[PDB]
Amino acid sequence: QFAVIKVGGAIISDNLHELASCLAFLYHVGLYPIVLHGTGPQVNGRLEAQGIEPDYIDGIRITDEHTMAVVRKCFLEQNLKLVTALEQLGVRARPITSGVFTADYLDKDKYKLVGNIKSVTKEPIEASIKAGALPILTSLAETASGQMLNVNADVAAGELARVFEPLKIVYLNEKGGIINGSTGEKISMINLDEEYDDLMKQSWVKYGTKLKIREIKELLDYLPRSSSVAIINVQDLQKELFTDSGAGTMIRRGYKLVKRSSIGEFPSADALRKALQRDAGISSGKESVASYLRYLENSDFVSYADEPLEAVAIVKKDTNVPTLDKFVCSDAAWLNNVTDNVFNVLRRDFPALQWVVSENDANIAWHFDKSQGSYLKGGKVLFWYGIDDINTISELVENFVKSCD
Amino acid sequence: TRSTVIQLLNNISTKREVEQYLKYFTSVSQQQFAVIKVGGAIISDNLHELASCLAFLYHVGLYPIVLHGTGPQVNGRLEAQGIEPDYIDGIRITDEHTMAVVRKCFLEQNLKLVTALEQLGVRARPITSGVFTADYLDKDKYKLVGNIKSVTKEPIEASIKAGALPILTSLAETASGQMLNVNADVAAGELARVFEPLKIVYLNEKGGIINGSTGEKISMINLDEEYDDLMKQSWVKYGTKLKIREIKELLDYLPRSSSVAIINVQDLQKELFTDSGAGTMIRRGYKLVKRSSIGEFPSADALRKALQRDAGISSGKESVASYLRYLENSDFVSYADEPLEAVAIVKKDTNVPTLDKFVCSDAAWLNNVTDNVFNVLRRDFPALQWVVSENDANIAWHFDKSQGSYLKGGKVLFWYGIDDINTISELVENFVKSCD
Amino acid sequence: TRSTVIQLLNNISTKREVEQYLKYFTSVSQQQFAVIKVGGAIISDNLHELASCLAFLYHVGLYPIVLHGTGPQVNGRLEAQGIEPDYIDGIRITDEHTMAVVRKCFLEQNLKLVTALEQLGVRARPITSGVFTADYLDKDKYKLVGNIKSVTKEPIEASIKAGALPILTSLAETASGQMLNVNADVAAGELARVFEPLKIVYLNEKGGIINGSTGEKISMINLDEEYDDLMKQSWVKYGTKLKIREIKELLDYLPRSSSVAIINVQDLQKELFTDSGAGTMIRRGYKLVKRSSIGEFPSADALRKALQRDAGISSGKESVASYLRYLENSDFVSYADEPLEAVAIVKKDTNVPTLDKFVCSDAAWLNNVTDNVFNVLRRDFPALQWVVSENDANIAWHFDKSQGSYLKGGKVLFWYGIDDINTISELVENFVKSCD
Amino acid sequence: QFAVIKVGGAIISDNLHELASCLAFLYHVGLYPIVLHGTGPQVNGRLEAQGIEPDYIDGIRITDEHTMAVVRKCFLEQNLKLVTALEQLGVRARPITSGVFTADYLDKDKYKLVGNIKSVTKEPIEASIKAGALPILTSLAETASGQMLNVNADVAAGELARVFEPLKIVYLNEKGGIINGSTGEKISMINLDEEYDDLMKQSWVKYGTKLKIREIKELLDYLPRSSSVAIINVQDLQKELFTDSGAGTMIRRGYKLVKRSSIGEFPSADALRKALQRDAGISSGKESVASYLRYLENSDFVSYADEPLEAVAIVKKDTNVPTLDKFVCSDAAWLNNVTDNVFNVLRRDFPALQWVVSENDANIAWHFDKSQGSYLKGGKVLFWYGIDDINTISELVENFVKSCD
Ligand SMILES: CC(=O)N[C@@H](CCC(=O)O)C(=O)O
């Protein structure tokens, strides 16, 4: 499912065209972002205009009875503004100003009419998408009994992400990305699994940053590995959504390969079976997975696979210059370069390696790029890397030719 | 669309239907089109009937504001949870828990209709809040029941402007943001007051109003003429009196162009454009004014204009000029509305009085002011004769109002109420005598 | 679209129009709607008029097969190349060179129309060959002129199926592949024969046929009844005689369902569905068969089934059984079409004969076989009386056929042709006498 | 204009979906190919079905009076079949079965009702495209007087290409190309200026082939040197339309390459020097063309150059496994695969060859495809072909490594 985009209210006032044209682009290429917005700046100006002092404790707006009336009006206006904007560019939008979030009071005497989201109702957002309209949500919850409660836009966004498990979660701000405070290096990427601990330890990472990165981790720990969070400025949005660099920060968990040395260590032997069935010489070749796995049990080998076994490499360690014996990766895996991931790991753990690919394998070109040498014979190509000993090359080639037997 | 045309044509029979449809499509006026109050019962039991019908209006380019309740569904749920549904004074005592059931039902019923319509290619836009603001009607008597203080146009407009049907729930909310339950029929009226739409359709089960003393389905009511004497009737029940009263009160506020329909769901497409349909259509109309001398007409020139549309004066061999000379010296009774859109003149000499002139513009034909005038005539003149051109546009209508007819020289003699075989001969003979 | 609906509704007046329109939208529809022969003169001088009009049909979901000539354009070119245009027997002597000019013109005229239609949003598909196969008509008399041996449907069908109007040139071709010039009016007939369309419209400049002695646009012609006496007329010019004759010859080949319209381009949308329009519509109409005894009816059971549709026999208190008893011993004339879709019975006793039964199915009403039957009646019975129920479905129609009417006891006495003041009294008195 | 695609009739019978869906894709992305189809088999199948020997001289069908009737019927059927197919997939198609080609008799007694296209009328094809419909032409001409004449599909296609000068000209066949009928070697390139005469002289080149290649030469003699024809299989159509490689036979005019063995034979020594100055290691590299040509004079070498010296290849013939020493081709040449031209000639004159390409040359992938083996070192890749002696490979690699001095 595609994206949840949290829009700061500031943007609807000051960049309606930039924003609208950009969502319109997504709409045009057939993508349907769930859009959820606040209304910060606008509201304080109105409360002043009516002689109400805007009022906060703990970074939360104390939303009393009168203030709610101003807040509600602003939400609804800001929300049509965006919908209208989008319609003008030919994009079907559907304002959804209630009926998505249900909440309790966060603290009835501290904050008055501020909410705490207890659940998300999908049906409106789905209906909208199904009917070919972008859904444009206000971050406004409501008790069962029907009192509307003001609720934090950033937390609403998260609650949606949790339910809809979208691929991208974009937080549109003014600032833009995150800047490394000690070198000014705009941080364009963060792989949490690797980088998180040492980033939180940094002198420069301010408290506000720590809390943001932490809350992003907490979100991403349960969504798919496919998902990611982007902190960008509005203009460089179209860019950051598909290019991994862009000009904003993109955070994600970062992907896993698991090194195993025995069938024993695989959590499901049946998962392995399915994984191996996509092979060119097992899918109906003359070697049943059954009997192949027999040979493995009694074999010096190292395997590398992601959790879903979308890519499985197997290095047989006998014969100096070990052989990459199987490398069975689904198309899904090729497109997300998990294949590059797996070779990178291989290249570090096996400084010399040989393998064979069919002369007209779909991505023979790729293999060539990863090799240091190639030899063609009988519609198969021997590839190897890291063995620039003139002599062991001869050995290698000779054995390969020997086995068109 | 083939689709639309087929369904248009299914719901036409008389030309007077065709002429009314045409008039709604060549509304050059960006006056607002219609508010349609839909009982909740209909969304459960006739979603297709209703949706296809709204879809037709959408297709022909008309954009009804649709406002719906949720009555039946809710009581069934409260029972299902072991809560007694609870009313005082015909109002639902909507406590905290009950509101939660009501709100859920509103939102469901509402998507149900929007989704339905989308499936048929109609852009719908659910508007479940932000239109009606209310106070509490009485906070300890009714708890969370509202009283509508105002209506916010922007959502409904924006929707229409962006090409989507707006589908409103009848659910108000205090400034502070507590949703209050509010009567669907009253909400419909408050919209109508603010948007001054041309049609206000109230979908019910009953259908129209039936004349309890003759079974004559009452298809039309011009209040300015008919209201008083209709309320005076033996057969008219209290429930009816209250409905008609509340419709008068509404239409007194709106333009003369506007009108209210009470119909059943199935005959909806029909009653929205055809003046007859199979339900009752109320509107203000104008009152007919009985006068007995040119003196009493406020504008003599207005009279002259009125009479010039005649088939035998617009260039026939009796100038209105000379006719109005004869009138001044004549025993006559006249009937016309204020705008002289319809004028009848009965010359009272000769037993069996002659309806000497009867000249109504097309406007008048479509709003059956013609029927109004004949009804008055039929009461004030139990026997009457009159002559219409052989190929008058609505010669058929005259035939229906007559008890007998005679054709000669491209004119038809019509009469009613004189079934004496003999005075008929006299009548016919004099009429023939005067083609020379 | 509002656009279309408006233009549909502009061209409706009677319900009989509405009911015909409905039939065409739920007809055989698509393939079998109509063949429209367009004179080439029109593609040069009225492309918009024509295009917009076809476009309207396309929009309400109808798919006319359009077949055009190229007359004028081609002579202008042949002159422009210094070739004399050349005819014997109303056929163009199409030699080798002249064919090249004819072919070029066909193909141009043909795109011109398709393009024009596309520009208005109508999918069109030029079909410039592969429909008609022909022999030489006479190789030395006419050179490259053809004689249509057969019509290949597949292209025309495919086009309609894929939602495009087919635009045919009238250009045949031998099996071996030499193109032969073929008369557009004859081509149109050959299509009609294969596709049995409901309408065959011949677009001309002239317009319809105008009664040269009263200026009365002749809007309808039932050939089986009217043909002989029309041809006998002083005013019917030779050119008219030849056209009507050639139309009879065509319609004698096609179904009874079929009909030919001779109209001008502008009143096309109108004449295609409305039975009046402002052009002449010809059709064969029906052989009504005059019988004077039950004996002569080919099936007595067919008669009984025919009469059972009556309002006072379908469950009224006079069984068809006993009615037919009374007929056997009765001076009567009956008129019925072959299918007994309409059956009229005139009881001949009592001066002013009575049309005693007139039992016509709805099918019959819509195809005005009822008008047929009355036309015959009117000729064979110069004075006639009849009684119809006050609320018969088409009481209005009866009124139009009468010269006088009297209402009593929910029945209307109608008569025609007796404008003797006195025998009218007699007539009315007897009628009143028999509600008791 | 985008492309003319000649579709063999065989394809409409055996791959209507493959073909239709593929054109449908082009239609969807807003491209409008002119599609011209034949009707070969279907017609031959009928003539057999009626016991008539299909009858050809010179690769042309002797179309008598009856045989034309069969042809015409088959054209019209095959043509709707394709239009209908496309419509079903949402693509507006417009059958154009006449009125595009006007012809004389090619030879009235040799071929009977076969035509010779005297002109092509654009207006129908343009109107169709303008009106948003794919035009689907039959290759069927007609005399001024209106006799329809049969015209080879391949020749009609050339006549369109001539008039419309489309960017791509695709000839869809079954083979996937032209396969050398005596060795099964898929011919991937044909430079007509060099190869044409000796290819037509071949035993295996069937009469149908001769007529297609001839009509392609005639076409390409009219058009720019930039233009070319691709004869591909249906599945690699989407591919060949945007990728410059794709994979079937690609024909084009090329230049006649001139084999010289001494500076003496070059008509201008100054023209040679200019040609070599575009090199990456002479344009300001540490080996002046001046001194390089000194070494050549005293060198066993073969050179190959077109007349304009847009491409110059130099094979140094010492050391078994000769070296392609210089290969200096302007960008113009690269884009028009003069590199393919030159390799074809090389492969015929030198059954074993070695050469070196930069690790990140723009078309390193191409070189890999032309090789039988590769070795990477010091940002250069050694390539060779035709030497599968395990031992001389060692020699080869060792010397190459030796020379990163
Ligand atoms: C044109 C001709 O003489 N011969 C070919 C043309 C059809 C095709 O190219 O498939 C034939 O078989 O009739």
Author numbering:
A (entry chain A), D (entry chain D): 98 to 502
B (entry chain B), C (entry chain C): 67 to 502
Copy out sentences from the published article reporting this entry, exactly as the authors wrote them:
The first step of the route is the production of N-acetyl-L-glutamate (NAG), while the second is the phosphorylation of NAG by NAG kinase (NAGK). We report here structural and functional studies on the arginine-sensitive NAGK from Saccharomyces cerevisiae (yNAGK). The structure of the mature yNAGK, lacking the N-terminal mitochondrial targeting sequence (residues 1–57), reveals an unexpected novel tetrameric architecture, which can be described as a dimer of dimers with D2 symmetry. The AAK domains occupy the center of the molecule flanked by two pairs of interacting DUF619 domains.
